[PDB]
Design a binder for this molecule. Structure first.
Ligand SMILES: [Mg+2]
Length: 246
């Protein structure tokens, strides 16, 4: 018996947004400005723990040194960082629009399995609506996008790990939560899903592989495409049958 709905997280599930999108936009900005700075995968992971985009650039330059092109004055440095971040933010949206952020393996396959088999599909994210809607429309394309309901940003007051986003999706779609499967990449998103009374499959992403997925119903490195498929729609349905303790 298939799920009534599949509910996908956006960042780390549909796309490896941080590793393959935000990090790239930082590097492309730095290159365009001739700063001679590159943030590779592992360093970027560390910088993700410091703060937001402006804060992690400030911390990085304070530690390693400011670029030769940067102003020396504290107020002018703050403006320089603001400019950099505005540029990075502009570029990241351009990257989506140009289709340069790849879907994760198996995403398009799984979405199409659902849509072709009468299973509802939604996306449930804390990210801003424009980016999430852009990811879906540009990267999954307009035919799929028309069928996919988006629940993002401030549509709920209580963000993950609160279940509000998942609950809203279930209510809106008109489906029983116990018949939904959520695909998440983070421990806090998993918490939201389980608190919503849903089955949750984790697909670890670039910066979440070491998080605590004990409460997940299944954990994988990705969804995958043949001939290296990790799971499919059928498996999502199978996973609805729980193994309780008699
Ligand atoms: Mg995520």
């Amino acid at each position: 018996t298939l799920p009534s709905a599949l509910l996908f997280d956006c960042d780390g599930v549909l796309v490896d947004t941080e590793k393959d999108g935000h990090r790239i936009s930082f590097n492309d900005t730095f290159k365009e400005r001739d700063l001679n700075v590159t943030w590779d995968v592992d360093l970027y992971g560390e910088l993700l723990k410091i703060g937001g985009g402006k804060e992690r650039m400030t911390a990085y330059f304070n530690k390693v040194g400011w670029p030769e092109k940067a102003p020396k004055d504290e107020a002018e440095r703050k403006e320089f960082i603001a400019g950099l971040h505005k540029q990075k933010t502009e570029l990241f949206m351009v990257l989506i629009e140009k289709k340069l952020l790849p879907l994760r393996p198996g995403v398009a396959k799984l979405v199409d399995q659902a849509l072709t088999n009468g299973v509802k599909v939604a996306v449930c994210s804390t990210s801003n609506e424009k980016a999430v809607s852009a990811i879906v429309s540009c990267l999954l394309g307009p035919e799929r996008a028309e069928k996919i309901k988006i629940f993002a940003g401030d549509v709920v007051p209580k963000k993950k790990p609160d279940p509000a986003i998942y609950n809203l999706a279930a209510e809106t779609l008109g489906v029983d939560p116990s018949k939904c499967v959520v695909v998440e990449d983070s421990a806090i998103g998993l918490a939201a899903a389980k608190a919503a009374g849903m089955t949750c499959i984790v697909t670890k992403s670039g910066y979440t592989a070491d998080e605590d997925f004990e409460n997940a119903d299944a954990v994988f490195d990705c969804i995958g495409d043949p001939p290296e498929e990790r799971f499919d729609l059928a498996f999502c349905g199978s996973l609805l049958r729980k193994q309780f303790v008699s």
